[PDB]
Amino acid sequence: VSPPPPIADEPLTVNTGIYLIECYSLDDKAETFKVNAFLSLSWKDRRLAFDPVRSGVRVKTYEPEAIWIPEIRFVNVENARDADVVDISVSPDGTVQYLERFSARVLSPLDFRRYPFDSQTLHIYLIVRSVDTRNIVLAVDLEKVGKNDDVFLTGWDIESFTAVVKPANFALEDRLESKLDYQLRISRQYFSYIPNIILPMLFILFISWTAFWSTSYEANVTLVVSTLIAHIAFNILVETNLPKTPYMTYTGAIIFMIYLFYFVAVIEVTVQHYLKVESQPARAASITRASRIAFPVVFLLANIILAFLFF
Amino acid sequence: VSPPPPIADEPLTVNTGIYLIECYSLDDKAETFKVNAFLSLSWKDRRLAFDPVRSGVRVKTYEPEAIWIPEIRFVNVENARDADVVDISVSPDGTVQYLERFSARVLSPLDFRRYPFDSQTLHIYLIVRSVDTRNIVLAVDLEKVGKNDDVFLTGWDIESFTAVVKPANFALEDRLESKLDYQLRISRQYFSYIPNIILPMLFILFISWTAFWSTSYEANVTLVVSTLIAHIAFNILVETNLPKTPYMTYTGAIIFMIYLFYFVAVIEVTVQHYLKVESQPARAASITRASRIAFPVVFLLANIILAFLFF
Amino acid sequence: VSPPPPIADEPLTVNTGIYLIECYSLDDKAETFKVNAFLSLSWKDRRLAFDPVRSGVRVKTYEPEAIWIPEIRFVNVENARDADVVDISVSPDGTVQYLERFSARVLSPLDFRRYPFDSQTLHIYLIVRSVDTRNIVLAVDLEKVGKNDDVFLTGWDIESFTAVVKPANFALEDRLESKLDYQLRISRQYFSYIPNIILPMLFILFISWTAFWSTSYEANVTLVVSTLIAHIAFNILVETNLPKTPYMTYTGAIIFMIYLFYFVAVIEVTVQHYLKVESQPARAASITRASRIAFPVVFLLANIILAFLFF
Amino acid sequence: VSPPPPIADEPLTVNTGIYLIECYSLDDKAETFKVNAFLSLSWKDRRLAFDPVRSGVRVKTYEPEAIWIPEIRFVNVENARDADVVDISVSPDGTVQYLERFSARVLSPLDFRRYPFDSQTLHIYLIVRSVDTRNIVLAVDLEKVGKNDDVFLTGWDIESFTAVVKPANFALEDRLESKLDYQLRISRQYFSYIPNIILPMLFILFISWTAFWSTSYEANVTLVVSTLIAHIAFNILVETNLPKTPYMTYTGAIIFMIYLFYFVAVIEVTVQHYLKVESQPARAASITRASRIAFPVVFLLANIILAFLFF
Amino acid sequence: VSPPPPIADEPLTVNTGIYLIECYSLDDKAETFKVNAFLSLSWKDRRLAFDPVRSGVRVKTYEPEAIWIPEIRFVNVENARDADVVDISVSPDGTVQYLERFSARVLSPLDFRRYPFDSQTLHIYLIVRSVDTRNIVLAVDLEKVGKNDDVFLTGWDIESFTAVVKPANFALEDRLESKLDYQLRISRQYFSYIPNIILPMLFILFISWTAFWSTSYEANVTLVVSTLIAHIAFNILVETNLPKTPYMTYTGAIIFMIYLFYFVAVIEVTVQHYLKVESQPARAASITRASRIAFPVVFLLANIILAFLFF
């Protein structure tokens, strides 16, 4: 079926909007998330006009393959959306309300530069293939959008759903400049991560720093080295939660800092024993007493510095 | 084929019900479970009337694509159900018994806030696309439903299969207000988890608390630190069973409590040694004797508190 | 094409049988196994009669979509079998030999209650959709069945392939009572598991029990606790082989027994040291000497008890 | 289209051969490998005869669905090969050169009985569904076969590509006796495995055997037990490379031998300490001095025995 | 539709080029990467000629199935590209601009011989099935190619996108000699890997080398052996990042070097203790003092040698 005849040169603006249902599988490995939402389409077609008691039906349902519908295709998806038409209701006023449920594997980059405390911005791109006249998809309904009333994707906090049509193209064709952009700026709630990940590493590190309140070399070595083994094992346990992160993560900088602190603690214990064995107890005691206060303070300063360079 | 002519304005109520077969893969990662069950559909069509010895067939089987069938589609699924028609039997009374086997990837949130002892509630949503008259799917058969006689999904206990039609919609269309809801409230049997997960952590913790019956510093450090390593390794072993759980789990609060107890035990051992080395054996003995009773009691109180805040 | 005209009221019995080819992927996670076997179908149709030197062809191959074939569908599968017709040979006697290769994802519960020594029973269900007359699929060929001559699924031992038609239904329809059941009772060969899993845990446990031939407290603590860490690490190594097993496994009861034995060994070492430090060497020596014999004997008794309650 | 008329009773032999492209994913879990190769088919059809300057085209390309092509189907595959016709060139001589690219998930048993040094033999089976006359697929081209010039599947060494037509059938039909077998005997290069797996276990074992050059019981226990923990951790690290291997592997027999050696080393250390504590230093020294030479020699003998029973 | 009539014997050269969109999943296990890019096709067809104010449309969009398009198929892919036509614009000049979005699972070997610092070269192959006249696909647009402006695949650095048509074939057909090759030479940025992987292993190794500043045998054994356990655990942690790598990796040669260094350190500690116990303190002190400087120097030399043989 040919597109409805344009009465004038006015572009056939289509009213569009996605009502989110289930945003799940937010990281298959680290990147894709899947959506199973509805999208509502409204436009103007030369369908039934005002109908005062002639046919008796207001929402005249039509076959999905009968009436022409604009071709709207997602840009950043694995494959074409699994479109399943739910209800095509055409009103006598002259507008067609199209509602289809699709399950697309949306693509969006995940920026884990501040992993425990990050706030990502998922993206959905819309393009319309113009046939005879230019179609402007910039018409955002702003009334058929929104997630579920539960307001949680998979344990995430939604902040906004700004939909701005950016007059930009991927250096191709002519109608690509009219892209419709869906910005879902979600924020991760971090309460669970504080005891799940952050606190136990600090507890293990403090168990390590205990080694400065001991004059026994064997006990000090056991503390520091076995605590290093415990920290590596806990890192293995945590690593299941963390994504690939090929670049430098924030939580990948605290862990390296903790490794450096283990190395410095081993060096300090060795220096203490080395000075204590060769008839210099005063220097060993001075170094131990200095380190008792110097290690936590330097750790606090390092954490503050990392927070400043990352936030 | 057009829908059968409604004799009056009575909505074409369809009798529906799912007879579960195999509820498996209850957590692909943590969320979806797959079903391979049958669903039975019964309605009223202008098919063959009473047939006293004329055709000789009562269950007149018809082609799946011949007779019109109502469009019933699952809401919370990955894709359209893999419907496979088994038997369309139309009775001379005027009712069509439709039975199709489908394998849908049903979506349902899993609430692991009390993981070992939880009781989830899986969901299945039903909607009917009305064509000419409103279709009410609220007609639940209540006789063609139920799981297998084995009564086990994958090691779960079934409690009820309440099917309540909630007059609610997802703020879209007109017929979405007639949603049919299938509540399968399943409960997890916890006998295996007590020795699989809970008991060994307590055994490791008691091995740690042994360190209060020793006056040797090297032995105490070995006990506590190597027991911490053992606990982290056992946590890694357990973590395969546990799902993602981005929020605060109950079993994720006992583990953090155990980490805190390891930290406090290390602090206590250090305090004992620190006081014992500098000519204060009385204070060290007093602290050790107090801790012997104070650690298990505080652990019991903490477990009771966690149970109260979680249950 | 309509089914061949029944000469009388005799049900159209179809001769069926599956010749297994490759039973692989026996546990995708713990439950499904995939089959890529052939199934042979023989029935009676009003095809070419006796043909003495008229056409000259005995096995008159026909198009898969030309001649009607009975609808046989698997019950416990993910989706419809990937049927691929290989050869439809119709004999002048009046029988059609149908042979199709299918790759279905068969569903079958796996009962790991005696995991190392278990003997499962895989299942395949057959149903026929009757059209005009009742079709009885109880006709098992008993000559076109059997696995490969290699006699191994994926490292399993086949015992029987009993095919009993159970006059039972899933409380639905009328022809479901004629289900055809394929019981493949396979047994797992356990020789590899004895050194892969069972023996190393016993070796680690004996290394632990060594601690009763030592009067050194630090050495005893090192033995028992580091051996507990080694046992947990070996449990992690084993856990890859083991399936989910949400219920109480046999091999999940030996492991818990070993954990309990580690706890009791720690308690015994602590009691020995506690009595030895406070001027009671006689009691410590008596307890150690008793434990030397009492631990292996109690372990043997516990293993015998577990074997009796599990086998 | 009917098959070309056979001029005589000569079977329509088809020239076939696979030119391998990318043999990858050699173990999805342990068994299947995927192929994305081309297969060349040549036969004799009643197509255009000798064409001296009449049409002017030698390789007269035809539509894939226009000219009849023999039905060649893979036996040991997940599903039907993803056949994609590339070029059907028919020569005036009377032969059709058919070339299609397929991506089949070939099935082949992997025999890891000598894992580091094994030499598998992948298999591909060919069958032709005869229609009017018997088709013999035994015609192997022997000129359109071969892997890539790189000569590497995924880090494997190719030795031969023998293609022998075995007159055997799977006890079914009549034309199954003409199966075409493709034997790709590949060999695994083992240089990387010697430092990746074999050498570090030997280094850890030698670190264990160090314990016989020490008279300290605590140091001996630390060495042997912590080395056992290190060996188990390294076994966990290796296990990712190794496949399931439900049966007795060669590399699964060296590991068990190493576990037995750890147990015997613990027993020897205990015996040394037991004799040394009760006023028998001569016997302890004799046992230690004997063990120093007796452990490596027995290990060498055990390795030789395992090599003989496995190779 | 037949191909447009060639005016002369000039081959129908097609202008082609891929504009990359999302190069993700660069290692499903170790080898494949997926693309979801557009490809632009331009050729010459006998379509509408110069059109001065007759039809009024310049980019006359045509149906994807209406106008003939050349058959361009990817060679090294899992299956046929998921082609989705976006816009077929034919200009009055006589050229057709074809633009389709495809999501192909491109195959390309990954060469991890210098893993942390490598620079791979992904490949895409193009072939055209000639019908009547030879089609030369060597026409590279060089203006419709390029990745996203972000210039990052999944944390990779792009260096060039050279597109050279290599007159080579896979020893098959006649038109295979005209293959079009897309070389995307990407380089991996290594900043994150230095603290993620390389630095912690060096820290653990230095903790091991600490053992040469101690005269205590128990402390030395604890250091070296527990540090070996820590290194193996960290190797397990790293191994998730690393691919299969069946051959000899660079980062798989530093790790083996570190294992050898642990073995040599254990031997040195044993030699020190062995000489110290039997009244040779001078030799033990000399060996310790020599090793203090000899271990880091030999490690530096070994790293330089490995860098030279690998780079």
Side-chain angles (χ1 to χ4, degrees), chain B residues 1-9 11 14-21 23-26 28-35 37-43 46 48-52 54-56 58 61-62 64-70 72-78 80-83 85-86 88-92 94-99 101-133 135-137 139-142 145-146 148 153 155-163 167-168 170-174 177-244 246-311:
Chain B
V1 188
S2 293
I7 59 171
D9 295 350
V14 57
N15 275 10
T16 180
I18 297 169
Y19 182 76
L20 301 153
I21 297 298
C23 310
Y24 60 77
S25 296
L26 277 76
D28 55 348
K29 201 182 291 182
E31 65 183 1
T32 80
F33 65 93
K34 274 166 73 83
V35 192
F38 304 92
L39 61 83
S40 169
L41 294 175
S42 166
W43 60 81
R46 304 289 91 180
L48 310 169
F50 75 112
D51 191 0
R54 306 159 182 176
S55 303
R58 303 303 103 190
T61 313
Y62 268 81
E65 268 200 11
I67 292 181
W68 164 93
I69 62 170
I72 285 177
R73 186 177 335 271
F74 278 37
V75 168
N76 48 1
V77 298
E78 294 293 328
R81 41 186 183 92
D82 181 342
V85 182
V86 174
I88 305 187
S89 296
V90 61
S91 68
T95 62
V96 182
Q97 195 212 8
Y98 177 86
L99 194 142
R101 175 168 69 67
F102 74 103
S103 55
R105 207 151 203 291
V106 180
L107 294 174
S108 278
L110 270 293
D111 186 74
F112 293 101
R113 253 158 184 83
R114 35 194 79 182
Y115 162 69
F117 294 98
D118 58 344
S119 65
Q120 314 287 314
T121 299
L122 317 179
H123 274 163
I124 278 167
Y125 289 131
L126 290 180
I127 51 163
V128 183
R129 176 208 304 179
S130 59
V131 178
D132 175 292
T133 51
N135 290 318
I136 170 169
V137 75
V140 185
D141 186 74
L142 285 177
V145 298
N148 285 327
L153 278 75
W156 280 82
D157 185 39
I158 301 105
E159 293 179 353
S160 61
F161 182 76
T162 297
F170 41 89
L172 290 174
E173 65 182 1
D174 315 320
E177 208 155 5
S178 171
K179 260 206 289 203
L180 185 52
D181 186 74
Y182 280 137
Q183 293 179 356
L184 180 63
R185 172 169 199 64
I186 49 175
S187 283
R188 172 184 275 134
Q189 70 275 17
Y190 48 87
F191 173 28
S192 171
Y193 295 89
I194 294 179
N196 274 358
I197 302 171
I198 290 183
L199 270 193
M201 293 183 286
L202 301 193
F203 286 154
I204 296 164
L205 190 48
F206 301 159
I207 291 175
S208 166
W209 293 346
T210 289
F212 309 136
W213 277 269
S214 178
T215 61
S216 172
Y217 184 41
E218 286 74 359
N220 277 358
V221 174
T222 299
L223 276 172
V224 187
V225 186
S226 295
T227 287
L228 163 68
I229 301 171
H231 172 267
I232 296 178
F234 189 78
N235 202 356
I236 300 174
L237 170 58
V238 168
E239 185 92 335
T240 61
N241 306 0
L242 269 49
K244 286 176 291 185
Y247 63 90
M248 197 44 161
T249 314
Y250 168 53
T251 193
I254 284 176
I255 291 175
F256 165 65
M257 185 64 72
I258 288 171
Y259 282 132
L260 173 58
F261 266 93
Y262 282 130
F263 179 41
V264 175
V266 164
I267 294 310
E268 198 276 343
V269 167
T270 315
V271 163
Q272 176 184 2
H273 180 58
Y274 176 44
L275 301 183
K276 185 167 49 73
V277 75
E278 293 179 353
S279 71
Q280 293 179 356
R283 283 193 62 171
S286 175
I287 290 174
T288 299
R289 193 165 302 119
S291 282
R292 284 176 199 189
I293 312 165
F295 262 76
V297 165
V298 162
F299 190 63
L300 262 182
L301 294 196
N303 268 21
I304 294 308
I305 292 318
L306 284 181
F308 269 18
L309 282 71
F310 271 100
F311 298 160

Side-chain angles (χ1 to χ4, degrees), chain E residues 4-9 11 14-21 23-26 28-35 37-43 46 48-52 54-56 58 61-62 64-70 72-78 80-83 85-86 88-92 94-99 101-133 135-137 139-142 145-146 148 153 155-163 167-168 170-174 177-244 246-303:
Chain E
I7 59 171
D9 295 350
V14 57
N15 275 10
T16 180
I18 297 169
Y19 182 76
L20 301 153
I21 297 298
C23 310
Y24 60 77
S25 296
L26 277 76
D28 55 348
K29 201 182 291 182
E31 65 183 1
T32 80
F33 65 93
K34 274 166 73 83
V35 192
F38 304 92
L39 61 83
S40 169
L41 294 175
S42 166
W43 60 81
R46 304 289 91 180
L48 310 169
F50 75 112
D51 191 0
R54 306 159 182 176
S55 303
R58 303 303 103 190
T61 313
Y62 268 81
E65 268 200 11
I67 292 181
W68 164 93
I69 62 170
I72 285 177
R73 186 177 335 271
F74 278 37
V75 168
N76 48 1
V77 298
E78 294 293 328
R81 41 186 183 92
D82 181 342
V85 182
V86 174
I88 305 187
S89 296
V90 61
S91 68
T95 62
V96 182
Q97 195 212 8
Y98 177 85
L99 194 142
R101 175 168 69 67
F102 74 103
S103 55
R105 207 151 203 291
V106 180
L107 294 174
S108 278
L110 270 293
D111 186 74
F112 293 101
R113 253 158 184 83
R114 35 194 79 182
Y115 162 69
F117 294 98
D118 58 344
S119 65
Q120 314 287 314
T121 299
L122 317 179
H123 274 163
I124 278 167
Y125 288 131
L126 290 180
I127 51 163
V128 183
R129 176 208 304 179
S130 59
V131 178
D132 175 292
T133 51
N135 290 318
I136 170 169
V137 75
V140 185
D141 186 74
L142 285 177
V145 298
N148 286 327
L153 278 75
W156 280 82
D157 185 39
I158 301 105
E159 293 179 353
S160 61
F161 182 76
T162 297
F170 41 89
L172 290 174
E173 65 182 1
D174 315 320
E177 208 155 5
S178 171
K179 260 206 289 203
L180 185 53
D181 186 74
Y182 280 137
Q183 293 179 356
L184 180 63
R185 172 169 199 64
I186 49 175
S187 283
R188 172 184 275 134
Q189 70 275 17
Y190 48 88
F191 173 28
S192 171
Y193 295 89
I194 294 179
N196 274 358
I197 302 171
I198 290 183
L199 270 194
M201 293 183 286
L202 301 193
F203 286 154
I204 296 164
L205 190 48
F206 301 159
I207 291 175
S208 166
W209 292 346
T210 289
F212 309 136
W213 277 269
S214 178
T215 62
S216 172
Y217 184 41
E218 286 74 359
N220 277 358
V221 174
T222 299
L223 276 172
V224 187
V225 186
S226 295
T227 287
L228 163 68
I229 301 171
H231 172 267
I232 296 178
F234 189 78
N235 202 356
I236 300 174
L237 169 58
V238 168
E239 185 92 335
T240 61
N241 306 0
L242 269 49
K244 286 176 291 185
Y247 63 90
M248 197 44 161
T249 314
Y250 168 53
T251 193
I254 284 176
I255 291 175
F256 165 65
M257 185 64 72
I258 288 171
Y259 282 132
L260 173 58
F261 266 93
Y262 282 130
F263 179 41
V264 175
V266 164
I267 294 310
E268 198 276 343
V269 167
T270 315
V271 163
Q272 176 184 2
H273 180 58
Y274 176 44
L275 300 183
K276 185 167 49 74
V277 75
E278 293 179 353
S279 71
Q280 293 179 356
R283 283 193 62 171
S286 175
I287 290 174
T288 299
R289 193 165 302 119
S291 282
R292 284 176 199 189
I293 312 165
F295 262 76
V297 165
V298 162
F299 190 63
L300 262 182
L301 294 196
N303 268 21

Side-chain angles (χ1 to χ4, degrees), chain C residues 1-9 11 14-21 23-26 28-35 37-43 46 48-52 54-56 58 61-62 64-70 72-78 80-83 85-86 88-92 94-99 101-133 135-137 139-142 145-146 148 153 155-163 167-168 170-174 177-244 246-311:
Chain C
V1 188
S2 293
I7 59 171
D9 295 350
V14 57
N15 275 10
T16 180
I18 297 169
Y19 182 76
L20 301 153
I21 297 298
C23 310
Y24 60 77
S25 296
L26 277 76
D28 55 348
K29 201 182 291 182
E31 65 183 1
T32 80
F33 65 93
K34 274 166 73 83
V35 192
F38 304 92
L39 61 83
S40 169
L41 294 175
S42 166
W43 60 81
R46 304 289 91 180
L48 310 169
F50 75 112
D51 191 0
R54 306 159 182 176
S55 303
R58 303 303 103 190
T61 313
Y62 268 81
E65 268 200 11
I67 292 181
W68 164 93
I69 62 170
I72 285 177
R73 186 177 335 271
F74 278 37
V75 168
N76 48 1
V77 298
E78 294 293 328
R81 41 186 183 92
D82 181 342
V85 182
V86 174
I88 305 187
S89 296
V90 61
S91 68
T95 62
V96 182
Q97 195 212 8
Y98 177 85
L99 194 142
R101 175 168 69 67
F102 74 103
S103 55
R105 207 151 203 291
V106 180
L107 294 174
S108 278
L110 270 293
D111 186 74
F112 293 101
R113 253 158 184 83
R114 35 194 79 182
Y115 162 69
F117 294 98
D118 58 344
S119 65
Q120 314 287 314
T121 299
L122 317 179
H123 274 163
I124 278 167
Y125 289 131
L126 290 180
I127 51 163
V128 183
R129 176 208 304 179
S130 59
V131 178
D132 175 292
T133 51
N135 290 318
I136 170 169
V137 75
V140 185
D141 186 74
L142 285 177
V145 298
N148 285 327
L153 278 75
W156 280 82
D157 185 39
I158 301 105
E159 293 179 353
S160 61
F161 182 76
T162 297
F170 41 89
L172 290 174
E173 65 182 1
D174 315 320
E177 208 155 5
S178 171
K179 260 206 289 203
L180 185 52
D181 186 74
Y182 280 137
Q183 293 179 356
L184 180 63
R185 172 169 199 64
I186 49 175
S187 283
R188 172 184 275 134
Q189 70 275 17
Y190 48 88
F191 173 28
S192 171
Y193 295 89
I194 294 179
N196 274 358
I197 302 171
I198 290 183
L199 270 194
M201 293 183 286
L202 301 193
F203 286 154
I204 296 164
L205 190 48
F206 301 159
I207 291 175
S208 166
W209 293 346
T210 289
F212 309 136
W213 277 269
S214 178
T215 61
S216 172
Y217 184 41
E218 286 74 359
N220 277 358
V221 174
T222 299
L223 276 172
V224 187
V225 186
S226 295
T227 287
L228 163 68
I229 301 171
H231 172 267
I232 296 178
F234 189 78
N235 202 356
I236 300 174
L237 169 58
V238 168
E239 185 91 335
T240 61
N241 306 0
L242 269 49
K244 286 176 291 185
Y247 63 90
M248 197 44 161
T249 314
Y250 168 53
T251 193
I254 284 176
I255 291 175
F256 165 65
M257 185 64 72
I258 288 171
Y259 282 132
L260 173 58
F261 266 93
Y262 282 130
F263 179 41
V264 175
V266 164
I267 294 310
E268 198 276 343
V269 167
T270 316
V271 163
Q272 176 184 2
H273 180 58
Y274 176 44
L275 301 183
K276 185 167 49 74
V277 75
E278 293 179 353
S279 71
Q280 293 179 356
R283 283 193 62 171
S286 175
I287 290 174
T288 299
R289 193 165 302 119
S291 282
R292 284 176 199 189
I293 312 165
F295 262 76
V297 165
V298 162
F299 190 63
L300 262 182
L301 294 196
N303 268 21
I304 294 308
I305 292 318
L306 284 181
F308 270 18
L309 282 71
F310 271 100
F311 298 160

